[model samples]
Target: GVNAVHWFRKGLRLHDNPALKECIQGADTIRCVYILDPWFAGSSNVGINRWRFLLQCLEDLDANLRKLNSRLFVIRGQPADVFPRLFKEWNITKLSIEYDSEPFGKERDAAIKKLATEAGVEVIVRISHTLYDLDKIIELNGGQPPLTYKRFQTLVSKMEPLEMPADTITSDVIGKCMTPLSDDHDEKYGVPSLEELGFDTDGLSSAVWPGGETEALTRLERHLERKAWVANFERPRMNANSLLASPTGLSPYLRFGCLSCRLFYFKLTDLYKKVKKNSSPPLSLYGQLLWREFFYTAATNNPRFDKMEGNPICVQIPWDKNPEALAKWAEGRTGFPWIDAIMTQLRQEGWIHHLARHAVACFLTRGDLWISWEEGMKVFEELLLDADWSINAGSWMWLSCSSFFQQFFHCYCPVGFGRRTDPNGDYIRRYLPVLRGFPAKYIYDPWNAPEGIQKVAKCLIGVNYPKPMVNHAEASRLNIERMKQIYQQLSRYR
Candidate 1:
């Protein structure tokens, strides 16, 4: 008989959990352990919303484990310190974990794997967090990741018959294993509240996107029920109008691994067959997932994927150190109603449309503020519920024309971009209530309104709301010229 410990990290759900399945096979006793550094929780890269979401995921995982006659052991400490003690105390014969592709996670997991083997414990790792084995994808590409999305897709097409999603943990599988529960289970190993984890929950609003596998799957089913929409979904066509929000709202689910990407991919394919019978599902349906995969593939090998310097794929840009401007953009005080509105939505709701992200990212980096994409990426990491490190950094680089994209002159007009999508400015009104009184024309550019119109609107420019941080016309033009010089210098190196 074997004693197994399944370490829960990103793969939070009981469904489509391959590594979790590995934890129960021929095992006499299985313990599901989730490690946390409570001190780090307060001072981590994430914000209050992200923390609350994680706590909810843990809570849900514990609830599901209870259904299998077990409970989650939420040990409080860094994983490196906790695993060695756990191997000895639990007499763990085997340790199972879902693979993590990030540089930090890879290093941490490698150390843990070493410790486990050194303590005479078996290590079983399954790649369920991502669609394909990222390293294998790199290997298949002749020892380098495909830099472009098209090239990545072409390479992935060769790796057909991809691994299918594993079945969920059921009573049949748990029948062979026992998780001993004691009277002090809650006292010893229980999910803590937000306050216990060092967050002030006073001003926290109701979750726009609630955490947990339960919520994730529920949302998934609801969207899948929309047959026609799923059958004809095209991402590019949904561009600016999608600023209202994506209908699926599945990004956070995928980010947390609460919903399996493979499951989603198969579901879309099956649904498309049902709707179109003979036609293959549009790339648009699966394109979003592939974009995520592309970033992971790009990031897996490079230790500096998250930064510009020393990162092989990233273009070196001498971006400005404007903390004050960055703060304005981050805090929803940039004075551009469209930009401020999106930032406010991001901070308050922990989610924003992809187009909305592009607008603000461009405004911060190449479009207006001329700040580094790293600063913008950090803000997203802090506040965004779905901020996967790879995707966040990758997108920031793309939007800022640092890499993946080079047309810096095609700037997103902070004023006109939002207006074009929502001419009536309903999105602005929803997120920025202070400018709700202004006419539709002035909603995006409130500063351009007449003094009489401002009086009528009851929100004076530079008083109730701040003035525009920078003149987009002048700033964008100058920035484009600077980008031209940089690219011209880059041509000599090429």
Candidate 2:
């Protein structure tokens, strides 16, 4: 019987966990451990919310594992440094882990494989996190940076069903993997509390999302219970007000791998077969997942995936760099009520609707403020639990009209766009209590309110709320002229 160790990372859930299953087959003992690496908590763009989500996920993961007569060993260090030592001490015969294709993960996996080889240990890697095996797709495309989503889909569509959750490990197979760390080490071998991770509980707040597979599965069942809604869900038509971020707000769970993309795909596909009412993509739920795959593939393949500089597909633009404007935008003090409200929501909740993201991204770039898209991307990276690299960059490029979408003239009017979805200004009223008493007509444009009306509303323009940063009509015209110049200049280089 094989003595195996499973290094738990992204594929945290037991449901459809290929690596865990692989570790169990023909094995007498299996050890499960998760490295609480410093990169995520110390230097990454992630914030307290993301850290808390991970801790909660780990807590839940350990709870579930305990029920199966094992526990998740949580240690704090780099995999490269820790695994080599562990392999020698624990006499690890085989190591199993989820396949990671992202830039950092790929590098880390390579180092671990070398250590395993030095130890003469077998390494088992299973690809379950992504819908399609990105490596195979890359090979199929002849290893090009310019792989299009349509082409990726054409190849992915031909692949058959692939799901591999391991059989449950029993008490009998519980390994000595959790053999306690020495008192000398900073090793807390279990899910850590916030204090232990050097963060305060109050600041480490979570969104409405409670982490783990249990909540994820419960949410899935609850959503699909409304089979009619699942069958007919159209993302564009759903105007999610701030009350409940999105009707089907399952993104954070999906981001953490607590929920299986395959399970959701099958559930939705099964429903659609019977009802045949779901709208087609880049609008449908399936289309939404395809978008995720598209960006993910793009990010993993191209090292220069996030930035406009050095990117192949991204167009170069001379964006303004005003630290003052960037700060105002990030802190939700843009003085445009709709922009302020959405930014406020993003800060407090770590999320907003797709259109809301569009409004803010557009405002930061070609629309009005004329700041760099990279700045806005960093803000998102700092805040959002779902702030993945590829989607973040892809969406930013689309909104800025720098790549993917080239309609720089089609800018979002902060007040106008929000008004279309929330005519009553209910969303603004909720997020921006400073403008609670303004009329429906003036709520979106409080600066233009009559002084007498502003006084009555108890939110005087330029007193309670700052005046609008830039005149929308004037800014839009300037950006259009600037866009024309950029296009002509870039065209000559070709």
Candidate 3:
């Protein structure tokens, strides 16, 4: 009897999935399986935002599988036990699954591959998650790891186009599959309750980002068609709203694999073909996708992505971590309204505009607060939906001048940049509701408000909101002096 089993992890989508396609092809019966491991459920390593997003992906996956005369078999316990038992029950002789590069995933995949071989079953792992497979990209560059994004992009641009494996799965192949899954598992699979996940979900209620394929497709369409925001993607970074447009479809879709990197690349290439005659921004947008891969490649190539500075020069820079100041900054009670607003948005939505990420990270690391780069990295890991280890760690290192050859000497001034970039304070007002009543001018600096205006606005400095965390001018000067000293020290090392 011809039988195959597809192990679903993050790659939850049916469309354009090489692993799923392989399993479905030439098999009289196929079982789609998703194992809810206790490691994921019980471990504190993953944050609440990621947990919720993962659950939403699982729910959507089960629903999608049900439509094709099959349903995802939810299995509990360790993969060692659950997977082998399923193989025995379904009489599956082969397993097809997507590849994962994360350290944990790589180890797990190796163990599973060994197990499957021991059971006399073939295990096929496909590279479907990334736009460019790391192995191919590494080979293209003569096996030398790319040290910079520009170099990686150049190599990617020169590489040949990717070909999607054909969708050759037959309805007849699915016809003889398990008719109805055995009801031998827990319906919930020990998914954590909101309270058990240990985070207050109150402030995040209004945030509209949803998880699953339906929502992912809707978002993709909105970015590509309805909103036509992709047309002007580059400028959105400057406009705060545009940064939102770039990664809009990325986070949730990536969390569940409802949309594969291959599909995203295909669409970008198709869009370029159609619109290249009209505009070049789409191509630029395509570069952002490549940059994501570049970071991934960097991390995969080098395990120390979470630790070493991308620029070795900044490693000696003295960073001041004031616990009291950092606590205020983290809690969104920083006296600086714009900075507070951005932090508050992160706390509330578990996401933020990209420009805000730069502004806030710059304000904290470069400004007088001078917290270690690890602090910002930890906070983002706790919150961001699209928080890939490579990107998060890489960006933090870049901002902190820890990345290789990218030592940024200047620290951004929060209030000054806030006034110039987000003059209207509309972005701030959306997140920091407490400052909604303040005048636009004072919104960026509540401490500067006239006594009467402050009273009228119903804001009491150091009471209702907070006073300025540090003197902006003095802090900026001090940071510059410290950064200059670090640069001098770094020069000696090089």
lDDT winner among the candidates?
1
Give candidate 3 misplaced runs (Cα > 4 Å).
1-3, 37-45, 76-92, 165-175, 183-207, 226-237, 240-251, 277-285, 309-318, 491-494
lDDT of 3 by residue, 1-494 (tens): 76888888877777667887776666777777777643554354566666677667766766766677666676666787777877787777889989886656787888999889888888888887787778678888887558687788778877777787445334543555543455643353323445544567775563345667766766666556622545544424366454232435566576467776677666666665576554333346676577777777777755566763453323655577688888887788878877887787777666776667887887778766888777888778777777767778878877777665676545666787777777888877877777788887888988888888878878778788888888978987888777767777876533
Ranking by lDDT: 1, 2, 3
TM-score of 1: 0.95
Better of 1 and 3 by TM-score: 1
Please list the residue runs of candidate 1 whose C-alpha ends up more than 4 Å from where it truly belongs after superposition: 41-43, 239-241, 245-247, 279-284, 492-494
lDDT of 2 by residue, 1-494 (tens): 46778888887788877777777767666768898874555456677667777888888888888777666788678888889888877788889988887887788798899989999999999887788787666666678533466676776665665554444344544343332334543255767776776776765444566778777888887666665654554553646443346435678877888887777787777666667754433225477677787777777867676787898778778788899989989999989999999888777777777777888888888878888888999999877778777778877876777776465446788788878878999988888998998999899998888998899999977789989988989998898778777776866422
Count of clashing residue pairs in every prediction: 0, 1, 9
Judging by lDDT, tell me the better candidate of 1 and 2: 1
What's the lDDT for candidate 1? 0.85
lDDT of each: 0.85, 0.76, 0.70
**Candidate 1 lDDT, 1-494, residue by residue in tens:** 68999998899999988888977888999999999776775347778888888999999999988899999999999888888888888889999999999998999899999998899998999998788888888998899988788888878777766677887898897877999788999998999889997778897777888889998888887667765655664544544456654445789989998898888888878877777885565566678789999999888888888898887777888899988988999999989999999999899889988778888988999889889999999999999989888988888888887777555446899999888888899888899988889999789999999999999989999999999999999999999888888887875423
Best by TM-score: 1
Q: In terms of TM-score, how similar is model 3 to the real structure?
A: 0.87
